[PDB]
Short mmCIF file of C-alpha atoms (C1' of nucleotides) in Angstrom, two decimals:
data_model
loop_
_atom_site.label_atom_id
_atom_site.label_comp_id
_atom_site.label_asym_id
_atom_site.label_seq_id
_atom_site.Cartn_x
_atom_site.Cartn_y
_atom_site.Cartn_z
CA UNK N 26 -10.53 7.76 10.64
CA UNK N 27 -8.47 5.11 9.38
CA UNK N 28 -4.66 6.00 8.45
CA UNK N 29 -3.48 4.11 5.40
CA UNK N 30 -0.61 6.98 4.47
CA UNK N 31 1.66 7.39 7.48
CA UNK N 32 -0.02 11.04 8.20
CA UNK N 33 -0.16 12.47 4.37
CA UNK N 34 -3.22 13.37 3.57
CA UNK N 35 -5.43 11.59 0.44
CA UNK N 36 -5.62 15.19 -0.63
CA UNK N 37 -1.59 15.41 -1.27
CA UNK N 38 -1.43 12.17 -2.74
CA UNK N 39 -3.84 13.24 -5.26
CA UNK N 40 -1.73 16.06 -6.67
CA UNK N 41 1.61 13.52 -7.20
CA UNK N 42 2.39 11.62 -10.17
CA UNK N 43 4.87 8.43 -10.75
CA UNK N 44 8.06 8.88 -12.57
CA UNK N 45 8.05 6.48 -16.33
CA UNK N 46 10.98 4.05 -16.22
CA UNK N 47 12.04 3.93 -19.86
CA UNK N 48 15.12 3.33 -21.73
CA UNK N 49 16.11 2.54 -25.46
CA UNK N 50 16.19 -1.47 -26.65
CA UNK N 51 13.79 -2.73 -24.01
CA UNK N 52 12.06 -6.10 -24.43
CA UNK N 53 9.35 -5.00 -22.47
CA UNK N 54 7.11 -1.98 -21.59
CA UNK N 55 4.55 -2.39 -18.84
CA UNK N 56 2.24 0.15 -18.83
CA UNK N 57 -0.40 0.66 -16.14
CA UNK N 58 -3.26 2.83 -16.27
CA UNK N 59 -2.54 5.08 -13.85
CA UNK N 60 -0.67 5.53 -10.21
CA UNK N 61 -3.30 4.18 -7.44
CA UNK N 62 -2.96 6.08 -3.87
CA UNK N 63 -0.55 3.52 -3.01
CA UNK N 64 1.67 4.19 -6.28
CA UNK N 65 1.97 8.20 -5.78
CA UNK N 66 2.76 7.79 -2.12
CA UNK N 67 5.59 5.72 -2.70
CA UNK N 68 6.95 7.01 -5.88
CA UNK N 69 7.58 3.29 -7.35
CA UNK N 70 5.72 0.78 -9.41
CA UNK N 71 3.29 -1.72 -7.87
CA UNK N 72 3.53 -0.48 -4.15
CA UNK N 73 0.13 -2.12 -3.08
CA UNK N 74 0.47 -4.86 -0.56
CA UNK N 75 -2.18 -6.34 -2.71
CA UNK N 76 -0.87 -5.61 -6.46
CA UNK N 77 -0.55 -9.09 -7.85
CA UNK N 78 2.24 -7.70 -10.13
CA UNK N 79 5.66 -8.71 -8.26
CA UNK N 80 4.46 -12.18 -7.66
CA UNK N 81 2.78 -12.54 -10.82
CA UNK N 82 6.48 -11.55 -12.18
CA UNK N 83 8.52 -14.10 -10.17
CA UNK N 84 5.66 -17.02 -10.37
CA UNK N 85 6.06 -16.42 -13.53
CA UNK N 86 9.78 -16.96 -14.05
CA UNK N 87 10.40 -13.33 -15.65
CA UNK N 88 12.19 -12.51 -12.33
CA UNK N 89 14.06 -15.28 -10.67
CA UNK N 90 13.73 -13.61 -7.08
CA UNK N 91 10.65 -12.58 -5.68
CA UNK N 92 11.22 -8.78 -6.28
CA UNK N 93 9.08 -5.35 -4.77
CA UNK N 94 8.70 -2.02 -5.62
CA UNK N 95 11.82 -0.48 -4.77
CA UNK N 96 13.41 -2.91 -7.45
CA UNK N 97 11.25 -1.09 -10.06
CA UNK N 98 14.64 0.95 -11.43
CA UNK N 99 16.75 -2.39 -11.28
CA UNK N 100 14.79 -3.48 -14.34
CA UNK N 101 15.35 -2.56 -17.66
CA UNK N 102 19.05 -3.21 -16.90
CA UNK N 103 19.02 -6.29 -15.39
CA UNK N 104 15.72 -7.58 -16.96
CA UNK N 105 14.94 -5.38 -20.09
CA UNK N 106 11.29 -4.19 -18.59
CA UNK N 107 10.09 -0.79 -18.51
CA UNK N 108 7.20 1.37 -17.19
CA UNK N 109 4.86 3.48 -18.01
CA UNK N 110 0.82 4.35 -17.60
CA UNK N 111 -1.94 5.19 -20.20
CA UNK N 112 -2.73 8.27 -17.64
CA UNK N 113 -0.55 10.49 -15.38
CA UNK N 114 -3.33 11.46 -12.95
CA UNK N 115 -3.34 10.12 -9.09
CA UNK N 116 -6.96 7.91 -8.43
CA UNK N 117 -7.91 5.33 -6.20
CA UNK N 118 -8.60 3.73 -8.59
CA UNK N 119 -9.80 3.34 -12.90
CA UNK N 120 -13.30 4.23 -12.00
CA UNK N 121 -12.57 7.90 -11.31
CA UNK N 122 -11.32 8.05 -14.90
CA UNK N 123 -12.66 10.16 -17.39
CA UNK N 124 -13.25 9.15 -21.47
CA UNK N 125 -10.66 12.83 -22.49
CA UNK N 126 -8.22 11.75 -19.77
CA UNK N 127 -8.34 8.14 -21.28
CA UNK N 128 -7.68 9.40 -24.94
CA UNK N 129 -5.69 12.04 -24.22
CA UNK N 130 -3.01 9.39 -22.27
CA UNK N 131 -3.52 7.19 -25.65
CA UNK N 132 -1.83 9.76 -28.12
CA UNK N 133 0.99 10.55 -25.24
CA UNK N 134 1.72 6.69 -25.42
CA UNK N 135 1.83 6.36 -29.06
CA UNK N 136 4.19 9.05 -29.39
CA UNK N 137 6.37 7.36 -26.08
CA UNK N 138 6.22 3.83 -27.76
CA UNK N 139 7.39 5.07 -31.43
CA UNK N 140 10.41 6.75 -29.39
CA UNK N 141 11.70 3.99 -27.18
CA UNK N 142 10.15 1.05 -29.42
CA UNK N 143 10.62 -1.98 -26.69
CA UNK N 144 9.92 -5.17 -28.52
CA UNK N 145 6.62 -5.59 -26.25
CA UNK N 146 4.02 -2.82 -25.43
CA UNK N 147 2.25 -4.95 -22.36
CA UNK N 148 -1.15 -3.45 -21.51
CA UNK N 149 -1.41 -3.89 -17.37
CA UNK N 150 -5.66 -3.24 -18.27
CA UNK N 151 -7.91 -4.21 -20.63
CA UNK N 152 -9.82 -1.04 -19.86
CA UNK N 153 -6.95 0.67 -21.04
CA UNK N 154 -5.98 -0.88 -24.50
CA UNK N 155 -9.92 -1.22 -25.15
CA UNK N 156 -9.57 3.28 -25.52
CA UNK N 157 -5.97 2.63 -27.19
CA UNK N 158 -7.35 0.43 -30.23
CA UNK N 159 -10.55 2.43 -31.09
CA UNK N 160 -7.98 5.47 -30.80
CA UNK N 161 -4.86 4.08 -32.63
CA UNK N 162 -5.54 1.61 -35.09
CA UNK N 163 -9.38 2.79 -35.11
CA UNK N 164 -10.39 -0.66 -34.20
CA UNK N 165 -13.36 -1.64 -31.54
CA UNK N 166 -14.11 -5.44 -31.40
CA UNK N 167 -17.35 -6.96 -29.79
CA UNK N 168 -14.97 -9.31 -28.39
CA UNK N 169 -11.45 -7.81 -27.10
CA UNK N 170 -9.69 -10.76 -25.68
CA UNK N 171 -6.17 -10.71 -23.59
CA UNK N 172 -2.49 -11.84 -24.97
CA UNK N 173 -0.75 -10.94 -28.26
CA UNK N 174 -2.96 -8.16 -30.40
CA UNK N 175 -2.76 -8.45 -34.37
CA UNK N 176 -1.86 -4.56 -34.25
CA UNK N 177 1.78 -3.66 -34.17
CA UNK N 178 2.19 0.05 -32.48
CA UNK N 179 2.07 2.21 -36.10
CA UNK N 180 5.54 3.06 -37.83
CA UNK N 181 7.40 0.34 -35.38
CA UNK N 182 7.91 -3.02 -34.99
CA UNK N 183 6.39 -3.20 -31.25
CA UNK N 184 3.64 -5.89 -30.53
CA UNK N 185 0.55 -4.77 -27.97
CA UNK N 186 -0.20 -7.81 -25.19
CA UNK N 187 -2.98 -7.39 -22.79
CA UNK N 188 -3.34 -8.80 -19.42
CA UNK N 189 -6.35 -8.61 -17.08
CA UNK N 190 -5.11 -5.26 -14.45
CA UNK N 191 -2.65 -6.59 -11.96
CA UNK N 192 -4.97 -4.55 -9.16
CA UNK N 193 -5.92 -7.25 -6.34
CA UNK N 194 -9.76 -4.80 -7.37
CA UNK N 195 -11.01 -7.28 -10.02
CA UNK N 196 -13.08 -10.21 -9.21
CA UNK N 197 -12.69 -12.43 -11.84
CA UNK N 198 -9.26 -13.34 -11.72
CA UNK N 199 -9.66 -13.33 -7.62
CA UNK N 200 -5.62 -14.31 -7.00
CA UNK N 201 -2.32 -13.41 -8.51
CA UNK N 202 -2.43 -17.45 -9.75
CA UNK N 203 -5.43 -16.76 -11.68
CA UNK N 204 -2.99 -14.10 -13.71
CA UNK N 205 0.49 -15.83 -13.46
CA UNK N 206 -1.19 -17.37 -16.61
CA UNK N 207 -0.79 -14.32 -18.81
CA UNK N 208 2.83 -13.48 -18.01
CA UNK N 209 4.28 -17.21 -18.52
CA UNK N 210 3.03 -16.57 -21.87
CA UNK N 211 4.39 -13.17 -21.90
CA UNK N 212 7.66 -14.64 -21.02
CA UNK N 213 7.12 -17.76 -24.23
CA UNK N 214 6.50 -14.34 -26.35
CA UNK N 215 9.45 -12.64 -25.32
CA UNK N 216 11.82 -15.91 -25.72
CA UNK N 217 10.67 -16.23 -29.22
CA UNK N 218 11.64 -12.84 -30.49
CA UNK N 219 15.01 -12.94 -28.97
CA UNK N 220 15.33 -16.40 -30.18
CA UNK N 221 14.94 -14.62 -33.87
CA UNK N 222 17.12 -12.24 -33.09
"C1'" DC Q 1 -36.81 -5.45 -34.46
"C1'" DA Q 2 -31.53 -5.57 -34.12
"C1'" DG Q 3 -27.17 -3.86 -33.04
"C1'" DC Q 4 -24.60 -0.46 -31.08
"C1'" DT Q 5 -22.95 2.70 -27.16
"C1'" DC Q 6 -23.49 4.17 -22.50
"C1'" DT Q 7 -24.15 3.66 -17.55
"C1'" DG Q 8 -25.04 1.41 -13.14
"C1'" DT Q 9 -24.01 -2.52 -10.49
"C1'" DA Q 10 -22.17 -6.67 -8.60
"C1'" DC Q 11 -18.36 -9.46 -7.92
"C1'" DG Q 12 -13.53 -13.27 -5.13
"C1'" DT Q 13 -9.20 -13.05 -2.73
"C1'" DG Q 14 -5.85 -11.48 0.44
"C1'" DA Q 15 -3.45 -7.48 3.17
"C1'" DG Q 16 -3.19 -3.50 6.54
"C1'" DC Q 17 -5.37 -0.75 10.26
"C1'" DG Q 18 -7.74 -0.37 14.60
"C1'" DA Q 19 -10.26 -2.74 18.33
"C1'" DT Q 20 -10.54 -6.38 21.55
"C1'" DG Q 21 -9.18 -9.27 25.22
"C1'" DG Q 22 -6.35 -13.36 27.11
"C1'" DA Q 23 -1.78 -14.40 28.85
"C1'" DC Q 24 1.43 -13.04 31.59
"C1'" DA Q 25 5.07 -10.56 34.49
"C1'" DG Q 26 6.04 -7.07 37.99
"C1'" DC Q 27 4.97 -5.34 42.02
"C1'" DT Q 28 2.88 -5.01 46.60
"C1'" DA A 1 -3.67 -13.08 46.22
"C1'" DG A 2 -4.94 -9.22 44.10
"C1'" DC A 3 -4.14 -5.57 41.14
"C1'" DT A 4 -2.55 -3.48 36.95
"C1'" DG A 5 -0.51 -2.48 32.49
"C1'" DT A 6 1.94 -4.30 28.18
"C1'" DC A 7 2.22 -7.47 24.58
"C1'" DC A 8 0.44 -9.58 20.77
"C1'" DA A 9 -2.75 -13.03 18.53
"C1'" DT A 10 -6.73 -12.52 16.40
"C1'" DC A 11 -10.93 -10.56 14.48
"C1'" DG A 12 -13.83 -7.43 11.47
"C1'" DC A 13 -13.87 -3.90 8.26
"C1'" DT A 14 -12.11 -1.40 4.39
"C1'" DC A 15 -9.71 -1.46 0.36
"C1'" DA A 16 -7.07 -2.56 -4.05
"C1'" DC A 17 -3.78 1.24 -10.69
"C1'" DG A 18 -11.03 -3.59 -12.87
"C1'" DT A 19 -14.05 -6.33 -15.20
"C1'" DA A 20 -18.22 -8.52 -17.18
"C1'" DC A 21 -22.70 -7.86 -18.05
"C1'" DA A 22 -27.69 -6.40 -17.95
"C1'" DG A 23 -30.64 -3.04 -19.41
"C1'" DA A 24 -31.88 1.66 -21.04
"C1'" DG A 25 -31.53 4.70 -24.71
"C1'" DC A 26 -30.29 5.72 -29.49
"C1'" DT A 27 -30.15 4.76 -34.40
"C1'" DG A 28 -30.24 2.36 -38.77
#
DNA sequence: CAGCTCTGTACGTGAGCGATGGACAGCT
DNA sequence: AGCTGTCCATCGCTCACGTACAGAGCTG
């Protein structure tokens, strides 16, 4: 047997769930679909050795360190970013996911985004904003494609950006530069509105 | 027929765990 | 010289908070 989890079982991990980091007045909301193995051991966003999230982050330029997991509280003070996840339930990973789960974590979000209304609702998944559309603004596209959606989150003034899943899982965007991509224009979208403001 | 949903399957990188074995020092 | 055990570089395998797409099965 290999031991990934420093003795805890697969079992336990399954049962945890990762803590949302949200405040008021955010710029930006990143929200996952739900905590990998990795994620509920740990108890912090982006844990995996192979999550292309931190370095997508700094390559980026939206973090001007290279930064890790256990900086995940650091941000929405020092760089206005949030967290959250479409589901609460522990999986290796979106696969294990059922369609009620799915919708279920869709009206929870709503309700979480028209409370804290950060100026960006970012969509770590397509998977996951794919459910959220045909759910919230009860609109399914042949073709769903990434960056800024023409749906702001009902009652609010909060924009919905997609970006292919930071998880190293998915083939075709193989590295973390094949993603950086999406968050430099993140960062262009987030300059903009704070250059209205 | 044609378009839609649903399901099974295949897919490129890079990182950690466990196994292997060469280098090498300590000791007779 | 011969033995022996540790260190650690390196390899192979598994995996990672998915995604695109063919094709079967409905339905208009």
């Amino acid at each position: 047997k290999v031991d990934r989890f420093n003795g805890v079982s697969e079992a336990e991990l399954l049962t945890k769930t990762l803590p949302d980091i949200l405040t008021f007045n955010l710029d930006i909301v990143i929200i996952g679909i739900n905590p990998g193995l990795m994620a509920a051991y740990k108890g912090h966003h982006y844990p995996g050795p192979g999550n292309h999230f931190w370095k997508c982050l700094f390559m980026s330029g939206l973090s001007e360190v290279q930064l890790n997991h256990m900086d995940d509280h650091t941000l929405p003070g020092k760089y206005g970013i949030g967290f959250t996840n479409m589901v609460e339930r522990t999986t290796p990973g979106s696969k294990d996911l059922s369609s009620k789960e799915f919708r279920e974590g869709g009206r929870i979000l709503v309700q979480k985004l028209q409370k804290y209304q950060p100026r960006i609702a970012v969509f770590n998944g397509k998977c996951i904003y794919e459910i959220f559309s045909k759910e919230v603004f009860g609109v399914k596209v042949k073709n769903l494609e990434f960056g800024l959606q023409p749906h702001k989150i009902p009652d609010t003034e909060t924009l919905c950006y997609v970006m292919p899943s930071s998880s190293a899982r998915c083939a075709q965007f193989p590295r973390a530069q094949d993603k950086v991509h999406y968050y430099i224009k993140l960062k262009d979208l987030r300059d903009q509105l704070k250059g209205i403001e």
